[PDB]
């Protein structure tokens, strides 16, 4: 899925 950390 989409990234969940920056």
């Amino acid at each position, epitope marked *: 899925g989409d990234l969940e*950390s*920056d």
Partner: antibody
Amino acid sequence: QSVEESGGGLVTPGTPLTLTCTVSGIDLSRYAMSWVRQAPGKGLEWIGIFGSLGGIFYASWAKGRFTISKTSPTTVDLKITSPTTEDTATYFCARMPYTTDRDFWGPGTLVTVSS
Amino acid sequence: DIVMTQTPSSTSAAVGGTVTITCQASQSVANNNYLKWYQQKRGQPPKQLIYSVSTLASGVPSRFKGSGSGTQFTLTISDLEADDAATYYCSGYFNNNIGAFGGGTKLEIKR
């Protein structure tokens, strides 16, 4: 913008143990929190992460052994499933961005597994 | 699994010298730039040095330089000071939303 771990100390082998990570000035609906650990004299070890979109991800070796959950807008939990001696370590909660310098680690809390 | 291999395990250099640390990830980091360099002391938590592979963290001296190519990254510390005595870690994130660290590099300052 500050972080503090709690719930560390001495625990008996096999007794579940829940650590709590408390943030102030950090939006867990928009930023991720990571759980890291460091055994005495050893390297940093990535345990898991509560993601910006509510995703929860664990290292291959940490799946089952830990449960991460968000209990309140300012708290994230790390439940260490049936602790063992090798789980003795300093446990850190961190706002650890890879692409910014808004990087905040708690001071760490020592978990000792012993009888 | 995912491995971040950090070399050398330990090294020494004198004040004013130069040390070079390499971090080799088993796969490309997320977005090709989820890569940070840390400095850690005993009684303390780690302190950021580099983010986005090469960007210098606020308040960090310019003698810390970050580089790399997709899977291999380099932290170069020039003009060494006594204060640089510490253990350095690479910290990476991966597309399956998974983080990892290198084994660390302990730096002893010769004198």
